[PDB]
Amino acid sequence: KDAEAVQKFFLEEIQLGEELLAQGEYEKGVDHLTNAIAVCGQPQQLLQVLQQTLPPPVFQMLLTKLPT
């Protein structure tokens, strides 16, 4: 449930998120990042990195979407 298989799964999820996020699909990117965070139950490292390396609007949406 948390092995390398789902690790590669959400790796591909955030890869497509990066691709469509540079392409402009911010809703698709935030949905894919939600699917990526919804498998690893405590990604504090990504919780801090994506607060910094991400553009302010996309993570501003995503942080609000995380309680939902």
Partner: peptide, 12 residues
Amino acid sequence: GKVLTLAALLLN
């Protein structure tokens, strides 16, 4: 320069 790929390959 896939920064999002390295945001998981070198994290957690």
